[PDB]
């Protein structure tokens, strides 16, 4: 299992000291995985 | 105390005695101011179907002979005590649960009723369950309960 | 002892705490009622009352109204009486800028750092009673409010 994409999760609190929300963002989903594959690997889990 | 009601039901509003005198006038087909076998056996038969059981003699034996207007009024007067109109019960039911939605859960209902206060048996409390219509999933509505406790609503009709 | 008025108050509390049988009294129940009936000191009096640190059976912790009365006297001899000067000085030491800008977090911290703690719903409940804003009080109002029962 490979985490093949960067991510950044920001969790929002309040001045009172309680959670209020969250915000995430991803960086550069690896491409060219559907096109020709190296030996003994698979493109993605969704297709399975 | 004595609970004899020496006065003619003075500890109540007087509107109900105009309704009671209207009831007395409509039952008294003889209109002599006194009930009778002639009176009830046909006025009760107006909505009834000529019952075979002799319970109108039950009334005339509960109070011997034909009963006066005041006698009827006082034998109802002894039947009212320690009760109040719908307003106070509605206000109390609004008080005990803040939501006031009348979602009196069965466990919550029994806990609030049978346990604290004047101790009495949950088995006799069950008369409020086998007869009074409780709402499903445990909660118990009160507005219909208050109406049926008062004269506003009745479970069934003859 | 006073006149029978205090005995009457204890009797009406006895019939008030009548759950699971009026006759038997739980030490938790008696402690709660004695505290509320004008006796603050309740923390370490379990050993001074029972004489036995046994606190394992919640269902049957034997106490009766008869011996309950001298217990109230030997508690009410007022073994400890503090006054607000020590309390306010401790809080002002606990205070940060002398006015109480935002006291909400640190009071919770100081109450959760104490070993002998029991409740959190009261910790969130203390907001009621003029303790509404972000620790706006300089503790004088809350000391006055708590010292009124
Ligand atoms: Mg990874
Ligand atoms: Mg007649």
Swiss-Prot record, chain A:
Muscle contraction. It comes from the Eukaryota. Belongs to the TRAFAC class myosin-kinesin ATPase superfamily. Myosin family. It is found in: Cytoplasm, Myofibril. This is Myosin-11. Muscle myosin is a hexameric protein that consists of 2 heavy chain subunits (MHC), 2 alkali light chain subunits (MLC) and 2 regulatory light chain subunits (MLC-2). The chain holds residues 244 to 291 of 1979 of the full protein. The rodlike tail sequence is highly repetitive, showing cycles of a 28-residue repeat pattern composed of 4 heptapeptides, characteristic for alpha-helical coiled coils. Limited proteolysis of myosin heavy chain produces 1 light meromyosin (LMM) and 1 heavy meromyosin (HMM). HMM can be further cleaved into 2 globular subfragments (S1) and 1 rod-shaped subfragment (S2).
Swiss-Prot record, chain B:
One of its GO terms (biological process) is myofibril assembly. It comes from the Eukaryota. CDD domains: EFh (cd00051). Ca(2+) binds at residues 28, 30, 32, 39. SMART domains: EFh. Keywords: Acetylation, Calcium, Metal-binding, Motor protein, Muscle protein, Myosin, Repeat. Pfam families: EF-hand_7. Residues 15-50, 84-119, 120-155 form the EF-hand domain. GO terms for molecular function: calcium ion binding; myosin heavy chain binding; myosin II binding; structural constituent of muscle. One of its GO terms (cellular component) is myosin II complex. Transmembrane segments: none annotated. InterPro entries: EF-hand-dom_pair, EF_Hand_1_Ca_BS, EF_hand_dom, Myosin_RLC. This chain binds calcium. Myosin regulatory subunit that plays an important role in regulation of both smooth muscle and nonmuscle cell contractile activity. Implicated in cytokinesis, receptor capping, and cell locomotion. Myosin is a hexamer of 2 heavy chains and 4 light chains. This is Myosin regulatory light chain 2, smooth muscle major isoform. It comes from Gallus gallus (Chicken).
Swiss-Prot record, chain C:
One of its GO terms (molecular function) is ADP binding. SMART domains: EFh. GO terms for cellular component: actomyosin; cytosol; muscle myosin complex; myosin II complex; myosin II filament. Keywords: Acetylation, Motor protein, Muscle protein, Myosin, Repeat. One of its GO terms (biological process) is myofibril assembly. The keyword Iron does not apply. SUPFAM superfamilies: EF-hand. It comes from the Eukaryota. This is Myosin light polypeptide 6. It comes from Gallus gallus (Chicken). The gene is MYL6.
């Amino acid at each position: 299992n490979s985490s093949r994409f960067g991510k950044f999760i920001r969790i929002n609190f309040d001045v009172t000291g309680y959670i209020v929300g969250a915000n995430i963002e991803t960086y550069l989903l690896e491409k060219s995985r559907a096109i020709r594959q190296a030996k003994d690997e698979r493109t993605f889990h969704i297709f399975y | 105390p004595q609970r004899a009601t020496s006065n003619v039901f003075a500890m109540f509003d007087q509107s109900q005695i105009q309704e009671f005198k209207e009831a007395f006038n409509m039952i008294d087909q003889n209109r002599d101011g006194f009930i009778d076998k002639e009176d009830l056996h046909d006025m009760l038969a107006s909505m009834g179907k000529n019952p075979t059981d002799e319970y109108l003699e039950g009334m005339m034996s509960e109070a011997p002979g034909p009963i006066n207007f005041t006698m009827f009024l006082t034998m109802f007067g002894e039947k009212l005590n320690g009760t109040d109109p719908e307003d106070v019960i509605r206000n109390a039911f609004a008080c005990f649960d803040e939501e006031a939605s009348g979602f009196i859960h069965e466990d919550h209902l029994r806990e609030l009723l049978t346990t604290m206060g004047d101790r009495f048996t949950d088995e006799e409390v069950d008369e409020m369950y086998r007869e009074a219509p409780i709402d499903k999933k445990g909660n118990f509505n009160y507005v219909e309960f208050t109406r049926i406790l008062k004269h506003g609503a009745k479970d069934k009709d003859d | 002892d006073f006149s029978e008025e205090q005995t009457a108050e204890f009797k009406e509390a006895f019939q008030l705490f009548d759950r699971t049988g009026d006759g038997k009294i739980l030490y938790s129940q008696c402690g709660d009622v004695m505290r509320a009936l004008g006796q603050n000191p309740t923390n370490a009096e379990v050993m001074k009352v029972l004489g036995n640190p046994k606190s394992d059976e919640m269902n049957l912790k034997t106490l009766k109204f008869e011996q309950f009365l001298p217990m109230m006297q030997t508690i009410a001899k007022n073994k400890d009486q503090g006054c607000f000067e020590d309390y306010v000085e401790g809080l002002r030491v606990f205070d940060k800028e002398g006015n109480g800008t935002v006291m909400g977090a640190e009071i919770r911290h100081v109450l959760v750092t104490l070993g002998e703690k029991m409740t959190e719903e009261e910790v969130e409940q203390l907001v009621a009673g003029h303790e509404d804003s972000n620790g706006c009080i300089n503790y004088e109002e809350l000391v006055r409010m708590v010292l009124s029962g």
